[PDB]
């Protein structure tokens, strides 16, 4: 037999009840986010995983990373979740940080050019998400070996 | 010393992991470190050839 | 090397010449009765293997769409000659036309008021003008290094 | 505590990039080690960082995982009579003490870690279903040879873990990699239904204990205080190494009383010094210092005898404990 | 880059195939890509070209230094240089094989290399080697350890004089004909 487990068991009054004979049922709650459903065996080292995403509606969208801190010259990525393939991006203050949506259009690469806050966002057509970004210089402080030299 | 005699182009030295709580060079100027159990102290004296 | 090694009883060591983190300078990997230390003439560090008391795993799946048939396509109508001012439509398909789109480009876009308009879904139309000469029609993909020629 | 990720699925194309971030429930400081189920199909950088960058390379599904670990301090038990030996391979060092694992240090790492694959053994269940399991393997000495790693006097355990000592067992790993150490020690590979074979021979000799080992011009030379051997490595076949007996009386004294000087070995055969180029041995101390060295070393602690190649001045001394010292001391005094 | 100069050319140009690596996508679809390869020394032997201490890059181009890597190219041509350095050829589904061995020695840095009577002699300041080239097979070159203390000093402190090598083993001069070394000083 097996044991059905779900991480962050807060997406329903009873997320997954004890399987009657082999399987159980699933439910949901009025919230979004990413979770994992681990179907673990009795005791043996067998731990599967099922990835489900609550779209937050019919064609809603929610970004994986909400707040990011990048150093100058670095780069990061973004991930979205929608039902409609067309995913047009739109970032205010465009010419401070560039973006390059991939083929799937559900992922985009970021490239920091200079210091300065940016609020890169997307637009599915009905809903919209945001992703605050705070560019930080490559350095935070420095130090010397002497302060009271004498020559 | 200004210029110590060398036995290698890269000037590598043979080091020893001593029982006297520290490292030691094996082939260097005349000096020998003989240990004494009476006072539990390290003693340095000239290298005695015979 | 440092004032901290003068209170240590080493049992063995080796002169490691290089290391990814270290620059082009050698160091030592010395061991003691309980721990393993490293010194590089600047400071002492205990790099003894640490034990993990607690561990937690994280599941994460990924899907890589097929890359087969995305390579350079093949053309059925490699060449097509028409009259002076004929606008014969074009018929062609890339390799299975799967998972990606293309962009139709033509060199010397002066052989018609609108030589090749943006393809509606996958293909576009062709026209002509009252002049002769040789040209090339490059059917380039979105960004990948795939540039055909007609 | 429990760990979760905001990302569970993604669609990529060969040539596109993506970056995932790991975040545990508590804000503490922990170590990370990313893993992959199917080798290839992706390229990783700085696996020890909470933000990994992946690059699609080939077609196929995949399931990535991130293992968070709360590293803590741990003290070893490498006494003076069981010190470290510190072999070298691919610029990586090894520890190899008794009661513990070799604890290799990778070239692109700043901490010591157990060897990969150490203890791995392939098991095939009913109907021919393969699987791998790790057992408590403990060694006494490890060296490098022919881009491989070896082991002596393995305390190979198993299910029903009453350990059975095999003082004549000798395992060898696969070939090295780019700035990394071997990654396979299992002899029962290729059983899941061409190159990279690991195995053992289980020698048969007298007094066993398989103490020492050392290479010489592509030919190994095993020493166990009696009945030395030779190692003949082949390119690749069923029998990669064929060991042939060499002597009946020769045999090293201690685990580190041998060293190469000039296409030969400087060994202590329990009675004197020998210098053999291969198939022929001599006596460097036949009737000059034999009765002196045997007397001076046989008093306090012979097993503490050591050697070192002082190539800087063309000298090979044999360290040993002085005449007057405690019987529990291992600090060589004379040479 | 090595920047070879062809025989029928009047300008210097990068080596052909330098950085080429065969990649096979899903379903077994082959393709080639060039990566930023940087070397430290290049020599000729057995109608081939070699490389030492390759800074082999890759996708996600954080370079990983392989100071023990050693690649060899295909055979020469008529008044031209080799044209293939990729080890992952013959993967697109008989002769002309290129590859490497990724030696395992001490202090690495694989500084120098030099041939001697069809037998290579690699030097890396310690743990010299020998190269045995075969006609054609899976393992075209099988490298066997030779010494444990011998090793060249600098990248150009060795030269053939009479069926032997004039090497500086960090402590003195040696003159070995193969399998036996001496001390000239």
PDB file of N, CA, C and O in Angstrom, chain A residues 41-83:
ATOM      1  N   UNK A  41       5.458   5.717   0.247  1.00  0.00           N
ATOM      2  CA  UNK A  41       5.079   4.355   0.593  1.00  0.00           C
ATOM      3  C   UNK A  41       5.027   4.225   2.115  1.00  0.00           C
ATOM      4  O   UNK A  41       5.154   5.204   2.857  1.00  0.00           O
ATOM      5  N   UNK A  42       4.833   2.998   2.599  1.00  0.00           N
ATOM      6  CA  UNK A  42       4.724   2.779   4.037  1.00  0.00           C
ATOM      7  C   UNK A  42       5.988   3.237   4.756  1.00  0.00           C
ATOM      8  O   UNK A  42       5.960   4.183   5.551  1.00  0.00           O
ATOM      9  N   UNK A  43       7.111   2.571   4.487  1.00  0.00           N
ATOM     10  CA  UNK A  43       8.390   2.941   5.083  1.00  0.00           C
ATOM     11  C   UNK A  43       9.556   2.942   4.107  1.00  0.00           C
ATOM     12  O   UNK A  43      10.560   3.607   4.387  1.00  0.00           O
ATOM     13  N   UNK A  44       9.468   2.231   2.986  1.00  0.00           N
ATOM     14  CA  UNK A  44      10.588   2.155   2.063  1.00  0.00           C
ATOM     15  C   UNK A  44      10.914   3.534   1.497  1.00  0.00           C
ATOM     16  O   UNK A  44      10.086   4.451   1.493  1.00  0.00           O
ATOM     17  N   UNK A  45      12.150   3.675   1.016  1.00  0.00           N
ATOM     18  CA  UNK A  45      12.636   4.943   0.474  1.00  0.00           C
ATOM     19  C   UNK A  45      12.073   5.140  -0.933  1.00  0.00           C
ATOM     20  O   UNK A  45      12.764   5.033  -1.948  1.00  0.00           O
ATOM     21  N   UNK A  46      10.777   5.434  -0.977  1.00  0.00           N
ATOM     22  CA  UNK A  46      10.064   5.712  -2.220  1.00  0.00           C
ATOM     23  C   UNK A  46       9.188   6.931  -1.969  1.00  0.00           C
ATOM     24  O   UNK A  46       8.135   6.823  -1.329  1.00  0.00           O
ATOM     25  N   UNK A  47       9.617   8.085  -2.472  1.00  0.00           N
ATOM     26  CA  UNK A  47       8.918   9.349  -2.276  1.00  0.00           C
ATOM     27  C   UNK A  47       8.748   9.991  -3.645  1.00  0.00           C
ATOM     28  O   UNK A  47       9.714  10.516  -4.213  1.00  0.00           O
ATOM     29  N   UNK A  48       7.529   9.950  -4.174  1.00  0.00           N
ATOM     30  CA  UNK A  48       7.229  10.563  -5.459  1.00  0.00           C
ATOM     31  C   UNK A  48       6.923  12.044  -5.247  1.00  0.00           C
ATOM     32  O   UNK A  48       7.109  12.594  -4.157  1.00  0.00           O
ATOM     33  N   UNK A  49       6.447  12.713  -6.294  1.00  0.00           N
ATOM     34  CA  UNK A  49       6.126  14.128  -6.204  1.00  0.00           C
ATOM     35  C   UNK A  49       5.196  14.497  -7.350  1.00  0.00           C
ATOM     36  O   UNK A  49       5.403  14.067  -8.486  1.00  0.00           O
ATOM     37  N   UNK A  50       4.176  15.292  -7.036  1.00  0.00           N
ATOM     38  CA  UNK A  50       3.226  15.795  -8.021  1.00  0.00           C
ATOM     39  C   UNK A  50       3.129  17.301  -7.851  1.00  0.00           C
ATOM     40  O   UNK A  50       2.878  17.791  -6.744  1.00  0.00           O
ATOM     41  N   UNK A  51       3.324  18.033  -8.944  1.00  0.00           N
ATOM     42  CA  UNK A  51       3.326  19.489  -8.926  1.00  0.00           C
ATOM     43  C   UNK A  51       1.994  19.999  -9.458  1.00  0.00           C
ATOM     44  O   UNK A  51       1.630  19.719 -10.605  1.00  0.00           O
ATOM     45  N   UNK A  52       1.272  20.742  -8.624  1.00  0.00           N
ATOM     46  CA  UNK A  52       0.003  21.353  -8.994  1.00  0.00           C
ATOM     47  C   UNK A  52       0.096  22.848  -8.729  1.00  0.00           C
ATOM     48  O   UNK A  52       0.764  23.279  -7.782  1.00  0.00           O
ATOM     49  N   UNK A  53      -0.573  23.636  -9.567  1.00  0.00           N
ATOM     50  CA  UNK A  53      -0.543  25.089  -9.461  1.00  0.00           C
ATOM     51  C   UNK A  53      -1.970  25.610  -9.478  1.00  0.00           C
ATOM     52  O   UNK A  53      -2.714  25.349 -10.428  1.00  0.00           O
ATOM     53  N   UNK A  54      -2.348  26.339  -8.433  1.00  0.00           N
ATOM     54  CA  UNK A  54      -3.657  26.980  -8.382  1.00  0.00           C
ATOM     55  C   UNK A  54      -3.584  28.273  -9.183  1.00  0.00           C
ATOM     56  O   UNK A  54      -2.894  29.220  -8.792  1.00  0.00           O
ATOM     57  N   UNK A  55      -4.300  28.314 -10.311  1.00  0.00           N
ATOM     58  CA  UNK A  55      -4.227  29.456 -11.220  1.00  0.00           C
ATOM     59  C   UNK A  55      -4.886  30.705 -10.659  1.00  0.00           C
ATOM     60  O   UNK A  55      -4.801  31.768 -11.285  1.00  0.00           O
ATOM     61  N   UNK A  56      -5.541  30.613  -9.502  1.00  0.00           N
ATOM     62  CA  UNK A  56      -6.179  31.748  -8.847  1.00  0.00           C
ATOM     63  C   UNK A  56      -7.401  32.251  -9.606  1.00  0.00           C
ATOM     64  O   UNK A  56      -7.781  33.417  -9.470  1.00  0.00           O
ATOM     65  N   UNK A  57      -8.028  31.394 -10.408  1.00  0.00           N
ATOM     66  CA  UNK A  57      -9.203  31.784 -11.162  1.00  0.00           C
ATOM     67  C   UNK A  57      -9.361  30.995 -12.444  1.00  0.00           C
ATOM     68  O   UNK A  57      -9.250  29.766 -12.444  1.00  0.00           O
ATOM     69  N   UNK A  58      -9.623  31.693 -13.546  1.00  0.00           N
ATOM     70  CA  UNK A  58      -9.743  31.081 -14.863  1.00  0.00           C
ATOM     71  C   UNK A  58      -8.495  31.247 -15.711  1.00  0.00           C
ATOM     72  O   UNK A  58      -8.041  30.281 -16.328  1.00  0.00           O
ATOM     73  N   UNK A  59      -7.930  32.455 -15.759  1.00  0.00           N
ATOM     74  CA  UNK A  59      -6.693  32.710 -16.487  1.00  0.00           C
ATOM     75  C   UNK A  59      -5.770  33.624 -15.692  1.00  0.00           C
ATOM     76  O   UNK A  59      -4.985  34.380 -16.276  1.00  0.00           O
ATOM     77  N   UNK A  60      -5.851  33.571 -14.365  1.00  0.00           N
ATOM     78  CA  UNK A  60      -5.036  34.420 -13.521  1.00  0.00           C
ATOM     79  C   UNK A  60      -3.553  34.178 -13.699  1.00  0.00           C
ATOM     80  O   UNK A  60      -3.144  33.353 -14.522  1.00  0.00           O
ATOM     81  N   UNK A  61      -2.737  34.890 -12.929  1.00  0.00           N
ATOM     82  CA  UNK A  61      -1.287  34.788 -13.050  1.00  0.00           C
ATOM     83  C   UNK A  61      -0.672  35.153 -11.709  1.00  0.00           C
ATOM     84  O   UNK A  61      -1.140  36.064 -11.021  1.00  0.00           O
ATOM     85  N   UNK A  62       0.384  34.429 -11.344  1.00  0.00           N
ATOM     86  CA  UNK A  62       1.132  34.712 -10.128  1.00  0.00           C
ATOM     87  C   UNK A  62       2.581  34.318 -10.357  1.00  0.00           C
ATOM     88  O   UNK A  62       2.856  33.225 -10.860  1.00  0.00           O
ATOM     89  N   UNK A  63       3.497  35.210 -10.000  1.00  0.00           N
ATOM     90  CA  UNK A  63       4.918  35.000 -10.219  1.00  0.00           C
ATOM     91  C   UNK A  63       5.523  34.221  -9.058  1.00  0.00           C
ATOM     92  O   UNK A  63       5.081  34.331  -7.911  1.00  0.00           O
ATOM     93  N   UNK A  64       6.549  33.429  -9.372  1.00  0.00           N
ATOM     94  CA  UNK A  64       7.212  32.631  -8.347  1.00  0.00           C
ATOM     95  C   UNK A  64       7.925  33.525  -7.340  1.00  0.00           C
ATOM     96  O   UNK A  64       7.639  33.482  -6.138  1.00  0.00           O
ATOM     97  N   UNK A  65       8.857  34.347  -7.816  1.00  0.00           N
ATOM     98  CA  UNK A  65       9.604  35.253  -6.956  1.00  0.00           C
ATOM     99  C   UNK A  65       8.931  36.618  -6.943  1.00  0.00           C
ATOM    100  O   UNK A  65       8.713  37.221  -8.000  1.00  0.00           O
ATOM    101  N   UNK A  66       8.604  37.102  -5.746  1.00  0.00           N
ATOM    102  CA  UNK A  66       7.946  38.393  -5.590  1.00  0.00           C
ATOM    103  C   UNK A  66       8.953  39.522  -5.404  1.00  0.00           C
ATOM    104  O   UNK A  66       8.829  40.578  -6.031  1.00  0.00           O
ATOM    105  N   UNK A  67       9.950  39.314  -4.547  1.00  0.00           N
ATOM    106  CA  UNK A  67      10.994  40.294  -4.287  1.00  0.00           C
ATOM    107  C   UNK A  67      12.344  39.674  -4.613  1.00  0.00           C
ATOM    108  O   UNK A  67      12.611  38.529  -4.236  1.00  0.00           O
ATOM    109  N   UNK A  68      13.189  40.430  -5.312  1.00  0.00           N
ATOM    110  CA  UNK A  68      14.493  39.946  -5.744  1.00  0.00           C
ATOM    111  C   UNK A  68      15.537  41.020  -5.473  1.00  0.00           C
ATOM    112  O   UNK A  68      15.246  42.219  -5.504  1.00  0.00           O
ATOM    113  N   UNK A  69      16.763  40.574  -5.208  1.00  0.00           N
ATOM    114  CA  UNK A  69      17.902  41.459  -4.985  1.00  0.00           C
ATOM    115  C   UNK A  69      19.048  40.976  -5.862  1.00  0.00           C
ATOM    116  O   UNK A  69      19.646  39.931  -5.586  1.00  0.00           O
ATOM    117  N   UNK A  70      19.352  41.734  -6.912  1.00  0.00           N
ATOM    118  CA  UNK A  70      20.374  41.362  -7.879  1.00  0.00           C
ATOM    119  C   UNK A  70      21.519  42.359  -7.796  1.00  0.00           C
ATOM    120  O   UNK A  70      21.319  43.548  -7.525  1.00  0.00           O
ATOM    121  N   UNK A  71      22.728  41.863  -8.034  1.00  0.00           N
ATOM    122  CA  UNK A  71      23.904  42.710  -8.134  1.00  0.00           C
ATOM    123  C   UNK A  71      24.112  43.136  -9.582  1.00  0.00           C
ATOM    124  O   UNK A  71      23.703  42.442 -10.517  1.00  0.00           O
ATOM    125  N   UNK A  72      24.746  44.293  -9.758  1.00  0.00           N
ATOM    126  CA  UNK A  72      24.979  44.814 -11.097  1.00  0.00           C
ATOM    127  C   UNK A  72      25.675  43.773 -11.963  1.00  0.00           C
ATOM    128  O   UNK A  72      26.605  43.093 -11.523  1.00  0.00           O
ATOM    129  N   UNK A  73      25.214  43.652 -13.207  1.00  0.00           N
ATOM    130  CA  UNK A  73      25.750  42.691 -14.142  1.00  0.00           C
ATOM    131  C   UNK A  73      25.175  41.297 -14.022  1.00  0.00           C
ATOM    132  O   UNK A  73      25.324  40.498 -14.952  1.00  0.00           O
ATOM    133  N   UNK A  74      24.523  40.981 -12.907  1.00  0.00           N
ATOM    134  CA  UNK A  74      23.926  39.679 -12.712  1.00  0.00           C
ATOM    135  C   UNK A  74      22.709  39.472 -13.593  1.00  0.00           C
ATOM    136  O   UNK A  74      22.422  40.236 -14.515  1.00  0.00           O
ATOM    137  N   UNK A  75      21.981  38.400 -13.292  1.00  0.00           N
ATOM    138  CA  UNK A  75      20.782  38.061 -14.044  1.00  0.00           C
ATOM    139  C   UNK A  75      19.968  37.053 -13.248  1.00  0.00           C
ATOM    140  O   UNK A  75      20.509  36.307 -12.428  1.00  0.00           O
ATOM    141  N   UNK A  76      18.662  37.045 -13.500  1.00  0.00           N
ATOM    142  CA  UNK A  76      17.743  36.129 -12.838  1.00  0.00           C
ATOM    143  C   UNK A  76      16.700  35.684 -13.856  1.00  0.00           C
ATOM    144  O   UNK A  76      16.786  36.004 -15.046  1.00  0.00           O
ATOM    145  N   UNK A  77      15.706  34.938 -13.381  1.00  0.00           N
ATOM    146  CA  UNK A  77      14.629  34.446 -14.227  1.00  0.00           C
ATOM    147  C   UNK A  77      13.307  34.601 -13.489  1.00  0.00           C
ATOM    148  O   UNK A  77      13.267  34.755 -12.266  1.00  0.00           O
ATOM    149  N   UNK A  78      12.220  34.560 -14.255  1.00  0.00           N
ATOM    150  CA  UNK A  78      10.873  34.673 -13.719  1.00  0.00           C
ATOM    151  C   UNK A  78      10.013  33.553 -14.282  1.00  0.00           C
ATOM    152  O   UNK A  78      10.244  33.083 -15.399  1.00  0.00           O
ATOM    153  N   UNK A  79       9.023  33.129 -13.501  1.00  0.00           N
ATOM    154  CA  UNK A  79       8.129  32.047 -13.884  1.00  0.00           C
ATOM    155  C   UNK A  79       6.695  32.465 -13.604  1.00  0.00           C
ATOM    156  O   UNK A  79       6.393  32.975 -12.520  1.00  0.00           O
ATOM    157  N   UNK A  80       5.818  32.248 -14.579  1.00  0.00           N
ATOM    158  CA  UNK A  80       4.408  32.581 -14.468  1.00  0.00           C
ATOM    159  C   UNK A  80       3.566  31.324 -14.641  1.00  0.00           C
ATOM    160  O   UNK A  80       4.055  30.267 -15.048  1.00  0.00           O
ATOM    161  N   UNK A  81       2.280  31.453 -14.324  1.00  0.00           N
ATOM    162  CA  UNK A  81       1.327  30.353 -14.421  1.00  0.00           C
ATOM    163  C   UNK A  81       0.017  30.917 -14.951  1.00  0.00           C
ATOM    164  O   UNK A  81      -0.604  31.763 -14.300  1.00  0.00           O
ATOM    165  N   UNK A  82      -0.406  30.450 -16.123  1.00  0.00           N
ATOM    166  CA  UNK A  82      -1.634  30.924 -16.742  1.00  0.00           C
ATOM    167  C   UNK A  82      -2.258  29.782 -17.532  1.00  0.00           C
ATOM    168  O   UNK A  82      -1.678  28.701 -17.668  1.00  0.00           O
ATOM    169  N   UNK A  83      -3.456  30.034 -18.054  1.00  0.00           N
ATOM    170  CA  UNK A  83      -4.129  29.082 -18.914  1.00  0.00           C
ATOM    171  C   UNK A  83      -3.991  29.465 -20.371  1.00  0.00           C
ATOM    172  O   UNK A  83      -3.993  28.604 -21.257  1.00  0.00           O
TER     173      UNK A  83
END
